């Protein structure tokens, strides 16, 4: 509904429509893949 202080709200917050829920879950679905892509690559940044 309205922004609240010091909230991460990663991927969205307070959906009030089925489409709004879809948007939040699409981001949540891809987020672990993004973490994998980052962690897997960064771990090899070294001599």
């Amino acid at each position: 509904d309205i922004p609240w202080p010091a909230r991460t709200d990663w991927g969205g917050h307070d959906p009030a429509t089925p489409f709004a829920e879809l948007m939040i879950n699409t981001h949540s679905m891809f987020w672990p893949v993004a973490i994998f892509i980052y962690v897997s690559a960064i771990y090899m940044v070294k001599k």
Binding site: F19, L22, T26, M29, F30, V33, I37
Partner: protein
Amino acid sequence: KSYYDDFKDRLKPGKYTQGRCPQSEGDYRQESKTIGREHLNDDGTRSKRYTVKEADALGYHYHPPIDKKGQVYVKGPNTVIERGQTWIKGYELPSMEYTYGPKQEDIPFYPRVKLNVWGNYNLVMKVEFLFFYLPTIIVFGICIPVYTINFAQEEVIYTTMTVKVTGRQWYWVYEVESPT
């Protein structure tokens, strides 16, 4: 040891801010009168006459260097005949202490080593395949989700009410059907 103390003597601390006296005390802007220094200012910088006002590229002081025979002066090598053979002794650069200052002693050892190359062609080829096709798989894993969510937004729904929204500078007008 402190290597700075070795060449401390060469570095005499300076007297003038930015290394020049006030122009009144000495006029560094004027061209030097010293013979053979007509192209330099008093402080040693190149004079504007030499570089700008009478630049040779503009046709001033035309003096072709090449001679009649199409030759220019060339300095020869240091040749030393020996053992029934003519040798050339190459010019070795001066000690780095002379040019840089630090005394060339206690140098850390860095051995000769040939280039660090990745081996095992078969293994390397498989990695390169993965470097390309692991991302391709991930993209393909997103493709189906992307299609579905796009189809969902563009779905013919049995809507029963309409709200018209017009955006103007700077307010939002709303038109709604009134109850009968």
